[PDB]
Scaffold this motif. Structure first.
Motif, PDB file in Angstrom:
ATOM      1  N   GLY A  83      -9.597 -27.364  -7.603  1.00 55.50           N
ATOM      2  CA  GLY A  83      -8.695 -28.538  -7.303  1.00 55.50           C
ATOM      3  C   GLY A  83      -7.484 -28.684  -8.381  1.00 55.50           C
ATOM      4  N   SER A  84      -7.233 -29.750  -8.364  1.00 54.64           N
ATOM      5  CA  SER A  84      -6.122 -29.928  -9.327  1.00 54.64           C
ATOM      6  C   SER A  84      -6.405 -31.286 -10.499  1.00 54.64           C
ATOM      7  N   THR A  85      -5.347 -31.718 -11.044  1.00 58.71           N
ATOM      8  CA  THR A  85      -5.351 -33.029 -11.756  1.00 58.71           C
ATOM      9  C   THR A  85      -3.974 -33.691 -11.989  1.00 58.71           C
ATOM     10  N   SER A  86      -3.836 -34.539 -12.845  1.00 58.61           N
ATOM     11  CA  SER A  86      -2.488 -35.313 -12.589  1.00 58.61           C
ATOM     12  C   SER A  86      -2.269 -35.524 -14.416  1.00 58.61           C
ATOM     13  N   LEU A  87      -1.159 -36.539 -14.461  1.00 54.31           N
ATOM     14  CA  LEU A  87      -0.621 -36.701 -15.649  1.00 54.31           C
ATOM     15  C   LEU A  87       0.040 -38.172 -15.838  1.00 54.31           C
ATOM     16  N   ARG A  88       0.448 -38.503 -16.970  1.00 57.86           N
ATOM     17  CA  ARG A  88       1.265 -39.650 -17.085  1.00 57.86           C
ATOM     18  C   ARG A  88       2.112 -39.837 -18.437  1.00 57.86           C
ATOM     19  N   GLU A  89       2.737 -41.193 -18.550  1.00 56.40           N
ATOM     20  CA  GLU A  89       3.483 -41.131 -19.664  1.00 56.40           C
ATOM     21  C   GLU A  89       3.844 -42.684 -20.063  1.00 56.40           C
ATOM     22  N   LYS A  90       4.489 -43.036 -21.302  1.00 55.85           N
ATOM     23  CA  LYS A  90       4.957 -44.394 -21.644  1.00 55.85           C
ATOM     24  C   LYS A  90       6.416 -44.430 -21.832  1.00 55.85           C
ATOM     25  N   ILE A  91       6.779 -45.586 -22.699  1.00 57.72           N
ATOM     26  CA  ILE A  91       8.202 -45.755 -22.902  1.00 57.72           C
ATOM     27  C   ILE A  91       8.368 -45.747 -24.103  1.00 57.72           C
ATOM     28  N   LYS A  92       7.278 -46.067 -25.074  1.00 61.52           N
ATOM     29  CA  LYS A  92       7.353 -45.976 -26.462  1.00 61.52           C
ATOM     30  C   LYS A  92       8.133 -47.313 -27.250  1.00 61.52           C
ATOM     31  N   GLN A  93       9.226 -47.247 -26.729  1.00 56.03           N
ATOM     32  CA  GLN A  93      10.173 -48.345 -27.175  1.00 56.03           C
ATOM     33  C   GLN A  93       9.277 -49.556 -26.981  1.00 56.03           C
ATOM     34  N   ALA A  94       8.680 -49.778 -25.961  1.00 52.57           N
ATOM     35  CA  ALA A  94       7.882 -51.015 -25.989  1.00 52.57           C
ATOM     36  C   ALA A  94       7.098 -51.644 -27.159  1.00 52.57           C
ATOM     37  N   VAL A  95       6.986 -50.470 -27.869  1.00 52.72           N
ATOM     38  CA  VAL A  95       6.264 -50.919 -29.335  1.00 52.72           C
ATOM     39  C   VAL A  95       6.907 -51.910 -29.892  1.00 52.72           C
TER      40      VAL A  95
END
Length: 101
Positions: A83-95
């Protein structure tokens, strides 16, 4: 070592012919416990092999328990395969919010 397998009926019928492979048949998820009772002792006798097509039914129940109780060789068939997978990310600036906080 012995040959212990846990799948369907038609599965045991195939090996039963040669008599060189003990396979079980667990059609129901709850009934699976029945075969597990005989495997708890036949697990340290040789090589074990089950089918995720029935075990998966008990993830946080079985897969979770066996996850740490995987002493013997429980060769599970299926589950992942290919099968397969996935990924994600953030904004950083939110810190920046932590600054004023």
């Amino acid at each position: 070592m012995e040959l212990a397998v846990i799948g369907k009926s038609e599965f045991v019928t195939g090996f039963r012919l040669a008599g060189i492979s003990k396979v079980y048949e667990t059609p129901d998820i709850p009934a699976t416990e029945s075969a597990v009772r005989s495997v708890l002792e036949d697990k340290s006798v040789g090589i074990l092999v089950m089918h995720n097509d029935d075990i998966g039914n008990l993830p946080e129940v079985l897969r979770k328990n066996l996850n740490e109780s995987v002493q013997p060789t429980v060769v599970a068939l299926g589950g992942s395969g290919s099968g397969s997978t996935s990924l994600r990310e953030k904004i950083k600036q939110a810190v920046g919010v932590d600054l004023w906080k």
